[PDB]
Protein backbone atom coordinates (compact mmCIF):
# COMPACT_ATOMS: atom_id res chain seq x y z
CA UNK A 1 0.00 0.00 0.00
CA UNK A 2 3.05 2.24 0.44
CA UNK A 3 3.64 2.57 -3.32
CA UNK A 4 3.73 6.38 -3.14
CA UNK A 5 7.24 5.91 -1.73
CA UNK A 6 7.95 3.55 -4.66
CA UNK A 7 7.35 6.39 -7.12
CA UNK A 8 10.25 8.30 -5.54
CA UNK A 9 12.75 5.73 -6.81
CA UNK A 10 11.08 4.14 -9.87
CA UNK A 11 11.26 7.50 -11.65
CA UNK A 12 15.04 7.43 -11.21
CA UNK A 13 15.04 4.06 -13.01
CA UNK A 14 14.16 5.90 -16.22
CA UNK A 15 17.19 5.68 -18.53
CA UNK A 16 18.30 9.30 -18.84
CA UNK A 17 21.31 9.18 -21.15
CA UNK A 18 22.06 12.75 -22.26
CA UNK A 19 21.92 14.11 -18.73
CA UNK A 20 18.48 15.31 -19.71
CA UNK A 21 15.19 13.46 -19.64
CA UNK A 22 13.91 11.38 -22.52
CA UNK A 23 10.42 10.47 -21.25
CA UNK A 24 9.08 14.00 -20.94
CA UNK A 25 5.53 14.67 -19.74
CA UNK A 26 4.37 15.74 -23.23
CA UNK A 27 4.28 12.17 -24.55
CA UNK A 28 2.03 11.05 -21.69
CA UNK A 29 -1.14 13.06 -22.32
CA UNK A 30 -2.64 10.10 -24.16
CA UNK A 31 -1.94 8.09 -21.01
CA UNK A 32 -2.56 10.16 -17.86
CA UNK A 33 -5.63 11.96 -19.19
CA UNK A 34 -7.43 8.71 -20.02
CA UNK A 35 -6.94 7.07 -16.62
CA UNK A 36 -8.67 10.09 -15.10
CA UNK A 37 -11.90 9.41 -17.00
CA UNK A 38 -12.52 5.96 -15.55
CA UNK A 39 -11.44 7.18 -12.10
CA UNK A 40 -14.15 9.86 -11.90
CA UNK A 41 -16.97 7.30 -12.12
CA UNK A 42 -15.16 4.45 -10.33
CA UNK A 43 -15.64 6.35 -7.08
CA UNK A 44 -19.22 7.18 -8.11
CA UNK A 45 -20.33 3.53 -7.92
CA UNK A 46 -21.60 2.77 -4.42
CA UNK A 47 -20.96 -0.96 -4.91
CA UNK A 48 -17.56 -2.30 -3.92
CA UNK A 49 -17.50 -5.24 -6.34
CA UNK A 50 -17.86 -4.02 -9.88
CA UNK A 51 -20.44 -4.63 -12.56
CA UNK A 52 -19.41 -6.45 -15.77
CA UNK A 53 -20.16 -3.13 -17.47
CA UNK A 54 -17.23 -1.74 -15.45
CA UNK A 55 -14.83 -4.70 -15.52
CA UNK A 56 -14.48 -4.48 -19.31
CA UNK A 57 -13.96 -0.72 -19.37
CA UNK A 58 -10.45 -0.83 -17.88
CA UNK A 59 -9.38 -3.12 -20.76
CA UNK A 60 -9.16 -0.23 -23.23
CA UNK A 61 -6.79 1.54 -20.83
CA UNK A 62 -4.76 -1.66 -20.74
CA UNK A 63 -4.36 -2.05 -24.49
CA UNK A 64 -3.55 1.60 -25.10
CA UNK A 65 -0.59 1.21 -22.76
CA UNK A 66 0.62 -1.76 -24.80
CA UNK A 67 0.00 0.27 -27.95
CA UNK A 68 2.27 2.93 -26.47
CA UNK A 69 4.72 0.22 -25.36
CA UNK A 70 4.92 -0.96 -28.96
CA UNK A 71 5.05 2.67 -30.05
CA UNK A 72 7.76 4.02 -27.76
CA UNK A 73 10.62 2.22 -26.01
CA UNK A 74 10.47 4.75 -23.17
CA UNK A 75 6.94 3.66 -22.23
CA UNK A 76 7.98 -0.01 -22.58
CA UNK A 77 10.50 0.46 -19.75
CA UNK A 78 8.08 2.79 -17.94
CA UNK A 79 5.52 -0.01 -17.64
CA UNK A 80 7.77 -2.92 -16.74
CA UNK A 81 9.65 -1.00 -14.06
CA UNK A 82 6.61 0.11 -12.07
CA UNK A 83 4.74 -3.01 -13.19
CA UNK A 84 1.67 -1.29 -14.66
CA UNK A 85 0.62 -4.15 -16.96
CA UNK A 86 1.46 -6.47 -14.08
CA UNK A 87 -1.01 -4.70 -11.78
CA UNK A 88 -3.46 -4.26 -14.67
CA UNK A 89 -4.16 -8.01 -14.76
CA UNK A 90 -5.87 -8.40 -11.37
CA UNK A 91 -7.38 -4.89 -11.63
CA UNK A 92 -10.55 -6.59 -12.86
CA UNK A 93 -11.02 -8.10 -9.38
CA UNK A 94 -12.08 -5.01 -7.42
CA UNK A 95 -11.70 -1.23 -7.55
CA UNK A 96 -9.57 -0.89 -4.40
CA UNK A 97 -6.48 -1.81 -6.39
CA UNK A 98 -7.87 0.29 -9.26
CA UNK A 99 -8.13 3.14 -6.79
CA UNK A 100 -4.63 2.39 -5.48
CA UNK A 101 -3.23 2.01 -9.01
CA UNK A 102 -4.25 5.48 -10.17
CA UNK A 103 -3.14 6.81 -6.79
CA UNK A 104 0.20 5.22 -7.61
CA UNK A 105 -0.04 6.59 -11.16
CA UNK A 106 -0.61 10.18 -9.99
CA UNK A 107 2.57 9.92 -7.93
CA UNK A 108 4.57 9.02 -11.05
CA UNK A 109 3.87 12.44 -12.55
CA UNK A 110 5.10 14.27 -9.48
CA UNK A 111 8.86 13.78 -9.21
CA UNK A 112 8.91 13.69 -13.01
CA UNK A 113 7.78 17.32 -13.06
CA UNK A 114 9.90 18.15 -9.97
CA UNK A 115 13.02 17.67 -12.11
CA UNK A 116 11.44 19.29 -15.20
CA UNK A 117 11.51 23.10 -15.73
CA UNK A 118 7.83 23.59 -16.77
CA UNK A 119 7.81 27.20 -17.91
CA UNK A 120 4.81 28.44 -19.89
Amino acid sequence: DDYVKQAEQVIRGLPKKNGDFELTTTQLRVLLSLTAQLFDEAQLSSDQNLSPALRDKVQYLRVRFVYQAGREKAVRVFVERAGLLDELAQIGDSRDRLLKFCHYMEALVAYKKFLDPKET
Binding site: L32, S33, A36, E106, K118
Partner: peptide
Protein backbone atom coordinates in the same frame (compact mmCIF):
# COMPACT_ATOMS: atom_id res chain seq x y z
CA UNK B 1 -5.45 19.61 -11.96
CA UNK B 2 -3.93 16.09 -12.06
CA UNK B 3 -4.69 14.88 -15.58
CA UNK B 4 -5.04 18.23 -17.35
CA UNK B 5 -2.65 20.70 -18.98
CA UNK B 6 -1.63 24.02 -17.38
CA UNK B 7 -4.73 25.60 -18.99
CA UNK B 8 -7.68 23.58 -17.63
CA UNK B 9 -11.46 23.66 -18.12
CA UNK B 10 -14.11 24.03 -15.41
CA UNK B 11 -15.97 20.93 -14.29
CA UNK B 12 -18.85 19.73 -12.08
CA UNK B 13 -16.91 19.21 -8.82
CA UNK B 14 -18.89 16.16 -7.71
CA UNK B 15 -18.63 14.38 -11.06
CA UNK B 16 -15.97 16.18 -13.21
Amino acid sequence: AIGAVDKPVVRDPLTK
